[PDB]
Ligand binder design. Structure first.
Ligand SMILES: Nc1nc2c(ncn2[C@@H]2O[C@H](COP(=O)(O)OP(=O)(O)NP(=O)(O)O)[C@@H](O)[C@H]2O)c(=O)[nH]1
Ligand SMILES: [Mg+2]
Lengths: 1011, 123, 208
C-alpha cells in the first residue's frame, strides 16, 4: 500500500497513518505485517525521528505507537544525549516527567496502559543516568514529596526507584564505565536514607495490594546492596515474615525478599542479629504452616495439579528454605527449643524433593549435598538429621536416573541414540549425595536396598522403573561399604539379579535385567578382583549377552567388558589356580565364536579390551606373542587382501573389499588405542604395505573424480575408499601420540609417511583432501617435531598455502580443515618455529594473514588458536633478540597486529575472545614501552621514540575509526592503556570502559583515571 | 486419527527429504516410522509417516503404480521418486521425495514392499 | 486459540533453526541472521484441541535488533535461547530476561540451552541456575538432534491452557487422492528429477 508516507519527513507526520502502520504490524498478518515491520524499523532508525516523538505522545490514540516513540527517545538518550543543546535536554525531561504524571493522575489510564507507563519510567531512568544527580539534585526529594499527592503517583514512584536500582547496581557492570557506575552508586547510597523512609512508611501503614506489591518489588532490588542496618535495626523483618506472608498477593514477592535477606553473611558474632535471623525464619515457617499447607501435605500432588501459582510458590519456597538453611541452619542446631523448627523446615524439603520436576529436584538435591557433606565432617551433627536422612535415602533411591553405561532405554525397550548429558550429570549428583548418605548410616542404606530387591524377587513391586532405579542405586554406592559387608552385599544382589533374568522371558524384560546386571557388576571391580570364580562367571555372562538379539545388550556387554578389564586386567593374564591357561589365551582362541554376532564397531571394542589385558604383561616376548595371537584373524585377512591387491590392482573396486579393508585397519586402531607404545611390533608387520595401499586407494580416488566429477566424492564407493585413508592416518596418529621410542618413529615411520601423504594431499583437488592429514601432521610435529626440522619444512610447503586458499574466502567452507589447519600452525610455531624462518617473505606474509584471519572467526576452535599463535609468534620474535628478521618483522607486522587486535576488540562481534585479545594487545604495547623493539617503527621527525610514535599512531587510528570521540577521550584512554600494560585486570577494565564510550557521545575522559 | 479403517502392511524407521529445485538442495521433512496402510474398504495402499515426538504428518499419499524408485548418487540406502499429490502439509502438492533408512537391508526391503503395494493399487 | 510467543537470545544461538525445524522439519545449516523479527504460525495438535503459536522469532544481533523490546508487547509466552558451546550467550541471558519481563511481567517463559549435540560443551549443566529464582522452565535442547525439541512448546501449551495433563496427539490422516502423473510433462519429469537424483543427500554419516 502507501504506508511508506510516514518515512517522508519534509511534509508532516500523519499521526493517524502512523497508528495504522503500527496496528497492521502488531495485529495484522502476512505481507501487510512484514511491510509494516520494515517501515516501522526505518521510521525508528531515523536520526530525526525523535523530534516527532513529542506529537506522537499527544495526538496518537495507540499505546503501541507511544511505546515506539519512547523507543526512539531511548535511543537518543542512551547514545546522543550530550550532543543536544541544553534547551532540548530540558525539553525532553519536562516532556517525559509531565507525561508520567499525566498518566498517573488519570485513574483509568493508570490501569489500562501499564506498559506505556513502564516504558516511560524506564525512559525517565535513562535520563537519570545522564543527568542525575549532578544536574537534577532534587529528584529524590521531589519524588518523595509527590508520593503523597496521589496513591497512583506513589506506586509508580516505586517502579521508577526499582528500575533505577536495577540499572545502577544490577546491570551497570557491562553498560557503564567504572567511574560512571561508581558515581551513580554513591549517589543512590547518599540518598537511600530518605528512600527507605518512604518505603517503610508505605509498608507500615499499607494502603491496598498494588502499592504494597510495587513497594516490595522495589525492596527486593534494594536488598542486593543496602546496608544491613536497614534490615535489622528496623521492624521490617517482622512485617515481611508475618504481615506480608498471610496475603497471597504479597506472599510471592515477600518470599523472594526473605530469600535475599537470608543470603547475606551476617556479623556471626552478634547475638542480637542472630536472634532476628532465627525470628523471621520462625515467623515465615509459622505462616506457611497455618495459612498455606502443613508439613504433612503432599507437595508432589499439589505441584502436579498446577492450580494458580502453586508451582511458582513451591519453587520459591524451595529456594527460600535452601538459601536460609545452607547459611544459617547452625543457629538452630544447638538450642533445643529450635529443634522442631529446624526439622519441620527440612521435612518441607523432603516433601519438596518428591515433586516430579527435574529442575526443582536439582535445586533441592544441591542443598542435600550441602547438608550431608557437612554431616560427614562436622562432629555431633549427624544425629540431629537421622530421620531426615533416612527419608532422603528412600527419595534418592526411588528417583535415580539412568547413568552413562546403561544403553537400554524405554521408548518398547530400544537402544540409546542420543546421550543425555543432563541426565548423566543428575545421576552423578545423586550418586554424590547417596554415597554420603551411605557413609552416614550403611545399615539403613543396605536394608532399604535389600528390602526393595526382595520385593522384585517376590514380584510384589516388580516393574522396569523399580528394578532400574534400585539397580542404579546399588551400583552408585560402590566403595562405601567394607569389603566384607560388600562381599555379602553384591553376592546377594548379583545372585538375585541372575535369578530374575532366567525367570522372566521376553525380548524386553530379559534386556532390562541384562543392563541392570551389567551396570552393577561393572561398578564393583574390587569385589571382582578378589573372587576369580565370580569374575570368570561374569565375563562369560557378558559373552552370553554378546549373542543377544538386542544391539543395546550387545553394545553394553562390550562396554562393560572394557570397564571391568580396565581394572581387573591382571587376573586375565596370569594362570589362575584350577585353570589350564591364562584366561586371555582362552578369550583369544574363541574370539571368532564370541564375536560372531557382533557388528564391526563392537568387534573392534572387543579387540581393544583384549589389548588392555595384553598390555598388562610386561615380559616383552610374551606380550609380543599375545599381540600376535590377537591379531591373527585381521592379519590373515590383511595378508590375503595384500597378496591379491598388489597383483590385480583393480580389486579395490569391490565395495565388499573396501569394507573388509576398513574394518581391518579399524581393528588395528582399536588395539593400538589401548596398547599404545606396545603396539609397535604389529604396526611394523603392516606399515610398509599399509602405506602402499594408501597410495593405491589414493589413485583410484583421483581416478573417480576425473572420470565422474567432484560428485564422485559423495558416492559410497569413494567415501568407502577415503575411509581407508582416514583410518590409516588415524592408526599412525594413534601410535605416534603414545610412542615412547621416538628414535624408531623418526628413523622408520616419519620418512615413508610424509612421502605417502604429503604430495597426495597437495596435488588432490580441494574436495578430495582429507583434513585428517593435517591432524596427523600435528601429532608428528608435537611428538618428534624437534628431531625432523626438514620434515616440518616439507609439511609446511605441502599443506600451508593450498589449505589456506581453501579457507580464506569465507568463514564456513571446509570446517574440519580450518580447525586442524590452525592446530597445525600452532604446534609448528610452538615446537619448531625455525620452519617459519625458512619461509619466503611472501609466504611469511600469508602466515601473518592466516593468523589475523583466525582472529575474525566466531568459531572458537579457530579463534582461540589464532590468538594463541599470535601470542606465541610475538614471543618467538622477541626471543631472537636484535637481528634483521626480528626487526624486519616489527617493521612490517607490529602495527598489523596492533590494529587487527583493536578491530576485533571493538567490532562488537568477537566478545567471546576478549580476554585473549586483551592479553595480546598488552604484550604488543609492552614491547614498545620496554624498548624491546630496537628499530623505528616508522618509515615523523627522527630521534622520536617508538613510545611516542605508538601513541600518535593509535590516536590517529582511533580518531578515524571512531570519529565521534573527542581528542581527549582518545588521549586519556591511550594514556591509561599505556600505564597499565603490565596489569591485565586494570588493562582489561580500561578496555571495557572504552567499549562503553564508543557506543555513546560525550564520554568523560576522566573515566580512564579509575585506577 | 483417521487410521482405524486401515491395516498396517509395512513399518520402518526412515528419514524423509523434499527436493527444493530452486536452491538445488535436499531439505529434511521428517524422521519417524514410515507405514504402508491398506484401506480395508477400498484396498488402496498409502504411505503415512509421522514425525517422532510431535506426531505431525510428513508424508501422506497413495503408493501410485506410476511411481518409480531411483537411487541417489550419495547413498546405497536411499530412494528417490516423484509424488504428484501429497497432503501432509495441507492442500495436495507435488514433491520429489527422498527417503533414507538405517541400512541397505531396510532400503532393499522397503523397495520390495513399495513394489508389492504397487501391485495392490493396480486393480 | 492462538497465543503470541516471542523468541529471544543472542545471535547464532539457534532461534531461527529451532523454529524452522518445527515449521517444515528441516535443519538449516547456514547462518542467515534474522532481520528484526519473523512471524511464523505454528500449530500443535493436543488432546484439548489444536493450539496455535504465533512465533515472533526476533533478531539477536544488535545491529539487526529492529524494534527490540517493541516486539514483546502483548506476548503471552516466551522462549529465551542460549548456546551451551558459548559462555557469552549464557551471560547475556539475564539481559534478555530483563528486557522481556519489563514488558511482559507475568508470562510463562522457557529457558533453552541449544546445541547440546556438540561434544565440546562449554556451559556445563552444573552452572545453569539462572532459571531458578526467575521461575523459568529449563530444557537442554538441540535443533540438530531434536533432543527435547518438543518440550518447550509442550510446557507452554500446558501453562497457557491450564491443563497439566495436556499431551500431543496424532493429527488425523485424511484419505489421500488417487492421481495419475502428467504425460504432458512426464517427458520432463526427468530433468528436475535426475537433478535431485544426482544431488547428494546431506549427512550421509548419520544413523538415518
Ligand atoms: N550443531 C548445532 N547447530 C545448530 C543448532 N541449532 C542451530 N544451529 C546452527 O547455529 C547457527 C545459527 O543459526 P540461527 O538459527 O540463524 O541462530 P539465530 O539465533 O536465529 N541468529 P540471529 O538471532 O542473528 O537471527 C546455524 O548455523 C545453525 O545450523 C544445533 O542445535 N546444533
Ligand atoms: Mg535468527
Amino acid at each position: 500500500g502507501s504506508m511508506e508516507g510516514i518515512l517522508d519527513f519534509s511534509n508532516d507526520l500523519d499521526i493517524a497513518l502512523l497508528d495504522q502502520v503500527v496496528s497492521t504490524f502488531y495485529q495484522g498478518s502476512g505481507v501487510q505485517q512484514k511491510q509494516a515491520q520494515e517501515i516501522l524499523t526505518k521510521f525508528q532508525d531515523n536520526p530525526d525521528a525523535w523530534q516527532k516523538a513529542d506529537q506522537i505522545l499527544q495526538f496518537s490514540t495507540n499505546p503501541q505507537s507511544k511505546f515506539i516513540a519512547l523507543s526512539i527517545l531511548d535511543k537518543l538518550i542512551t547514545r546522543k544525549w550530550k550532543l543536544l543543546p541544553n534547551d532540548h535536554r530540558i525539553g525532553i525531561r519536562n516532556f517525559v516527567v509531565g507525561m508520567i504524571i499525566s498518566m498517573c493522575q488519570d485513574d483509568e489510564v493508570f490501569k489500562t496502559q501499564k506498559n506505556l507507563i513502564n516504558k516511560s519510567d524506564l525512559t525517565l531512568v535513562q535520563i537519570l543516568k545522564q543527568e542525575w544527580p549532578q544536574n537534577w539534585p532534587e529528584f529524590i526529594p521531589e519524588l518523595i514529596g509527590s508520593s503523597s499527592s496521589s496513591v497512583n503517583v506513589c506506586e509508580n514512584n516505586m517502579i521508577v526507584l526499582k528500575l533505577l536500582s536495577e540499572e545502577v547496581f544490577d546491570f551497570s557492570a557491562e553498560q557503564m564505565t567504572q567511574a560512571k557506575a561508581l558515581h551513580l552508586k554513591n549517589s543512590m547510597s547518599k540518598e537511600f536514607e530518605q528512600i527507605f523512609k518512604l518505603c517503610f512508611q508505605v509498608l507500615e501503614q499499607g494502603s491496598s495490594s498494588s502499592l504494597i506489591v510495587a513497594t516490595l518489588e522495589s525492596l527486593l532490588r534494594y536488598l542486593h546492596w543496602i546496608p544491613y542496618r536497614y534490615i535489622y535495626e528496623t521492624n521490617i523483618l517482622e512485617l515481611l515474615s508475618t504481615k506480608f506472608m498471610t496475603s497471597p498477593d504479597t506472599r510471592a514477592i515477600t518470599l523472594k525478599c526473605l530469600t535475599e535477606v537470608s543470603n547475606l553473611k551476617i556479623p556471626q558474632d552478634n547475638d542480637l542479629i542472630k536472634r532476628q535471623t532465627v525470628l523471621f525464619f520462625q515467623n515465615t515457617l509459622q505462616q506457611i504452616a497455618t495459612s498455606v499447607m502443613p508439613v504433612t501435605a503432599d507437595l508432589k500432588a499439589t505441584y502436579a495439579n498446577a492450580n494458580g501459582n502453586d508451582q511458582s510458590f513451591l519453587q520459591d519456597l524451595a529456594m527460600f528454605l535452601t538459601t536460609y538453611l545452607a547459611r544459617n541452619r547452625a543457629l538452630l542446631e544447638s538450642d533445643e527449643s529450635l529443634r522442631e523448627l529446624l526439622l519441620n523446615a527440612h521435612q518441607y524439603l523432603i516433601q519438596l524433593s518428591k515433586i516430579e520436576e527435574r529442575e526443582l529436584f536439582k535445586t533441592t538435591l544441591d542443598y542435600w549435598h550441602n547438608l550431608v557433606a557437612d554431616l560427614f565432617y562436622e562432629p555431633l551433627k549427624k544425629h540431629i538429621y537421622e530421620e531426615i536422612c533416612s527419608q532422603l535415602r528412600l527419595v534418592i533411591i526411588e528417583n535415580m536416573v539412568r547413568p552413562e553405561e546403561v544403553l537400554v532405554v524405554e521408548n518398547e525397550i530400544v537402544r540409546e541414540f542420543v546421550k543425555e548429558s543432563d541426565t548423566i550429570q543428575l545421576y552423578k549428583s545423586e550418586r554424590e549425595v547417596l554415597v554420603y548418605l551411605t557413609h552416614l548410616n550403611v545399615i539403613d542404606t543396605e536394608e532399604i536396598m535389600i528390602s526393595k530387591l526382595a520385593r522384585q524377587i517376590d514380584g510384589s513391586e516388580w516393574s522396569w522403573h523399580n528394578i532400574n532405579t534400585l539397580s542404579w542405586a546399588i551400583g552408585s554406592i560402590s566403595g562405601t561399604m567394607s569389603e566384607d559387608t560388600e562381599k555379602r552385599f553384591v553376592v546377594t544382589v548379583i545372585k538375585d539379579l541372575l535369578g530374575l533374568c532366567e525367570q522372566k522371558r521376553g525380548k524386553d524384560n530379559k534386556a532390562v535385567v541384562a543392563s541392570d546386571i551389567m551396570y552393577v557388576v561393572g561398578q564393583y571391580p574390587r569385589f571382582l578382583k578378589a573372587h576369580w570364580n565370580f569374575l570368570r562367571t561374569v565375563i562369560l555372562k557378558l559373552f552370553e549377552f554378546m549373542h543377544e538379539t538386542h544391539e543395546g545388550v550387545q553394545d553394553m556387554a562390550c562396554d562393560t567388558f572394557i570397564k571391568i578389564v580396565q581394572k581387573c586386567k591382571y587376573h586375565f593374564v596370569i594362570q589362575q589356580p584350577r585353570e589350564s591357561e591364562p584366561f586371555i589365551q582362552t578369550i583369544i582362541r574363541d574370539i571368532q565364536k564370541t564375536t560372531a554376532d557382533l557388528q564391526p564397531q563392537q568387534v573392534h571394542t572387543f579387540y581393544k579390551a583384549c589389548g588392555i589385558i595384553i598390555s598388562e604383561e610386561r615380559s616383552v616376548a610374551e606380550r609380543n606373542r599375545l599381540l600376535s595371537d590377537l591379531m591373527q584373524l585381521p592379519n590373515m585377512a590383511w595378508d590375503t587382501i595384500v597378496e591379491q591387491s598388489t597383483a590385480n590392482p583393480t580389486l579395490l573396486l569391490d565395495s565388499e573389499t573396501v569394507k573388509i579393508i576398513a574394518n581391518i585397519i579399524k581393528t588395528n586402531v582399536a588395539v593400538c588405542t589401548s596398547m599404545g607404545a606396545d603396539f609397535y611390533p604389529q604396526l611394523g608387520h603392516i606399515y610398509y604395505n599399509m602405506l602402499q595401499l594408501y597410495r593405491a586407494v589414493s589413485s583410484m580416488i583421483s581416478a573417480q573424480v576425473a572420470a565422474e566429477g567432484l560428485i564422485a566424492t559423495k558416492t559410497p564407493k569413494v567415501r568407502g575408499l577415503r575411509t581407508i585413508k582416514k583410518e590409516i592416518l588415524k592408526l599412525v596418529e594413534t601410535y605416534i601420540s603414545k610412542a615412547r621410542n621416538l628414535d624408531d618413529v623418526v628413523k622408520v615411520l616419519v620418512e615413508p609417511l610424509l612421502n605417502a601423504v604429503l604430495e597426495d594431499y597437495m596435488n588432490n583437488v580441494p574436495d578430495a583432501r582429507d583434513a585428517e592429514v593435517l591432524n596427523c601432521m600435528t601429532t608428528v610435529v608435537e611428538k618428534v617435531g624437534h628431531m625432523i626440522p626438514q620434515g616440518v619444512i616439507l609439511i609446511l610447503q605441502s599443506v600451508f598455502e593450498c589449505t589456506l586458499d581453501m579457507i580464506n574466502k569465507d568463514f564456513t567452507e571446509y570446517p574440519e580443515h580450518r580447525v586442524e589447519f590452525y592446530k597445525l600452525l600452532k604446534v609448528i610455531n610452538e615446537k619448531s618455529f625455525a620452519a617459519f624462518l625458512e619461509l619466503p617473505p611472501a609466504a611469511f606474509k600469508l602466515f601473518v594473514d592466516a593468523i589475523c584471519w583466525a582472529f575474525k572467526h566466531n568459531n572458537r576452535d579457530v579463534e582461540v588458536n589464532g590468538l594463541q599463535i599470535a601470542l606465541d609468534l610475538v614471543k618467538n620474535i622477541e626471543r631472537m633478540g636484535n637481528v634483521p628478521f626480528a626487526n624486519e618483522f616489527h617493521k612490517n607486522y607490529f602495527f598489523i597486529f596492533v590494529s587487527e587486535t583493536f578491530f576485533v576488540l571493538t567490532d562488537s562481534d568477537h566478545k567471546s575472545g576478549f580476554s585473549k585479545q586483551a592479553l595480546l594487545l598488552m604484550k604488543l604495547i609492552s614491547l614498545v614501552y620496554d624498548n624491546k623493539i630496537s628499530v623505528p617503527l616508522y618509515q615523523v621527525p627522527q630521534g622520536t621514540s617508538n613510545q611516542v610514535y605508538l601513541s600518535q599512531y593509535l590516536a590517529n587510528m582511533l580518531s578515524n575509526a571512531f570519529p565521534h570521540l573527542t581528542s581527549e577521550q582518545i588521549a586519556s584512554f591511550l594514556s591509561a592503556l599505556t600505564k597499565q600494560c603490565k596489569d591485565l585486570v586494570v588493562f582489561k577494565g580500561t578496555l571495557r570502559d572504552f567499549l562503553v564510550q564508543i557506543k555513546e557521545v560525550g564520554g568523560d575522559p576522566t573515566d580512564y583515571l579509575f585506577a | 486419527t483417521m487410521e482405524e479403517d486401515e491395516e498396517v502392511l509395512y513399518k520402518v524407521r526412515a528419514k524423509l527429504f523434499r527436493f527444493d529445485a530452486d536452491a538445488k538442495e535436499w531439505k529434511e521433512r521428517g524422521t519417524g516410522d514410515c507405514k504402508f496402510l491398506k484401506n480395508k474398504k477400498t484396498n488402496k495402499v498409502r504411505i503415512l509417516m509421522r514425525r517422532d515426538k510431535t506426531l505431525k504428518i510428513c508424508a501422506n499419499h497413495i503408493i501410485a503404480p506410476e511411481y518409480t524408485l531411483k537411487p541417489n548418487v550419495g547413498s546405497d540406502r536411499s530412494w528417490v521418486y516423484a509424488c504428484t499429490a501429497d497432503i501432509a502439509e495441507g492442500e495436495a502438492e507435488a514433491f520429489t521425495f527422498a527417503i533414507r533408512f538405517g541400512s541397505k537391508e531396510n532400503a532393499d526391503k522397503f523397495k520390495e514392499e513399495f513394489e508389492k503395494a504397487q501391485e495392490i493399487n493396480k486393480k | 486459540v492462538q497465543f503470541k510467543l516471542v523468541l529471544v537470545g543472542d545471535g547464532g544461538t539457534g532461534k531461527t533453526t529451532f523454529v524452522k525445524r518445527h515449521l517444515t522439519g528441516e535443519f538449516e545449516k547456514k547462518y542467515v541472521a534474522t532481520l528484526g523479527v519473523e512471524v511464523h504460525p505454528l500449530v500443535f495438535h493436543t488432546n484439548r484441541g489444536p493450539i496455535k503459536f504465533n512465533v515472533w522469532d526476533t533478531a539477536g544481533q544488535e545491529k539487526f535488533g529492529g524494534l527490540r523490546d517493541g516486539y514483546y508487547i502483548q506476548a503471552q509466552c516466551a522462549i529465551i535461547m542460549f548456546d551451551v558451546t558459548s559462555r557469552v550467550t549464557y551471560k547475556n541471558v539475564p539481559n534478555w530476561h530483563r528486557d522481556l519481563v519489563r514488558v511482559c511481567e507475568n508470562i510463562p517463559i522457557v529457558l533453552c540451552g541449544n546445541k547440546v549435540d556438540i561434544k565440546d560443551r562449554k556451559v556445563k549443566a552444573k552452572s545453569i541456575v539462572f532459571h531458578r529464582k526467575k521461575n523459568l522452565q529449563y530444557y537442554d535442547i538441540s535443533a540438530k538432534s531434536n533432543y527435547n525439541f518438543e518440550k518447550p512448546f509442550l510446557w507452554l501449551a500446558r501453562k497457557l491452557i491450564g491443563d497439566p495433563n495436556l499431551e500431543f496427539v496424532a493429527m488425523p490422516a485424511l484419505a489421500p487422492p488417487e492421481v495419475v502423473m502428467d504425460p504432458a510433462l512426464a517427458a520432463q519429469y526427468e530433468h528436475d528429477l535426475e537433478v535431485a537424483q544426482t544431488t547428494a543427500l546431506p549427512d550421509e554419516d548419520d544413523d538415518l
